[PDB]
């Protein structure tokens, strides 16, 4: 991303849905879901906060943070090495190798029994009060506008208080927009290039930065001169 | 030496390979960067066939 996620407050999007005189029944609890639905369907991971928090395996399983939602890697906290993803089908089964995760709620399921392991993963930026934190990026909050616009008149219209018009106008003007705000939150920057770059113009290829939590992704390969 | 009492030398004779009073760019000092070059090319080839 060029731009920067500076943070301000929901309501700001109501600032921008009641300039409209049939978008006036709009209110906070409606803004909080469809503002989680499209931070949701656009995906955008410059949205989340990046947190890393420890925690310990009792036998191949560890309690996981309350506001986790996505994990970027998990690593041992001795070694430093990163953990992949468990393809074993029988991992704390007995009968009568290189280290695993797997994670479904609030449980990470390790192929370890007693150790201590990092998890670096993704959160939502909150407010003073216990509620989503949106970008001013005024693309996001266009096309977020334009998302709550477009729902609110899907329900007119399926009532019939919306001509069809009005529906395509407003869906095709979102269409462009969340097309729009998906390119903005995803270009690289110029320091962003940078380290494509460096990742691109190998003569010896670099493909372990897996193990370590992908520092060294972006560093330039030297080659000596002879 | 028949004539210079201060002509003495040692046990060990030998000689560089140099040019013109430098260090000596031996053959396999003017190879090396093209084995380096197959080496690193190699291995791209490697990884190709890999995967």
């Given at each position: 991303m060029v731009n920067n996620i500076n943070w301000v407050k929901l309501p700001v999007i109501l600032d921008r849905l009641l300039r409209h005189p049939l978008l006036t029944d709009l209110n906070l609890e409606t803004a909080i879901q469809y503002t989680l639905d499209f931070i949701s369907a656009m995906?955008?991971?410059?949205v989340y906060v990046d947190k890393i928090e420890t925690i310990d395996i009792k036998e191949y399983r560890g309690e996981l943070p309350?506001?986790?939602?996505?994990?970027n890697q998990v690593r041992l906290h001795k070694n430093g090495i990163a953990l992949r993803a468990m393809?074993?089908?029988?991992?704390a089964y007995p009968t009568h190798g290189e280290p695993s995760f797997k994670t479904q709620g609030r449980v990470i399921f390790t192929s370890i029994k007693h150790e201590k392991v990092d998890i670096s993963y993704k959160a939502i930026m909150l407010d003073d009060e216990g509620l989503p934190l949106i970008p001013d990026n005024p693309i996001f909050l266009k096309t977020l506008e334009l998302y709550i616009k477009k729902e609110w008149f899907t329900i007119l219209f399926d009532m019939g208080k919306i001509s069809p018009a009005v529906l395509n106008n407003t869906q095709q003007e979102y269409a462009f927009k969340a097309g729009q705000c998906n390119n903005e939150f995803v270009i690289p920057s110029v320091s962003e290039m940078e380290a494509i770059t460096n990742m691109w113009?190998?003569?010896?290829?670099?493909?372990?930065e897996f193990r370590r939590?992908?520092?060294?992704?972006?560093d330039k390969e030297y080659i000596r001169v002879h | 030496r028949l004539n210079n009492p201060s002509r003495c030398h040692f046990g060990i004779v030998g000689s560089i390979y140099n040019?013109?009073?430098?260090?000596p760019f031996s053959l396999v000092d003017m190879m090396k960067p093209y084995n380096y070059l197959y080496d690193a090319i190699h291995d791209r080839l490697n990884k190709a066939i890999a995967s």
């Open positions: 995906g955008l991971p410059n309350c506001d986790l939602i996505s994990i393809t074993d089908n029988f991992n113009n190998q003569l010896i290829p670099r493909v372990t939590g992908f520092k060294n992704l972006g | 040019l013109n009073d430098s260090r």
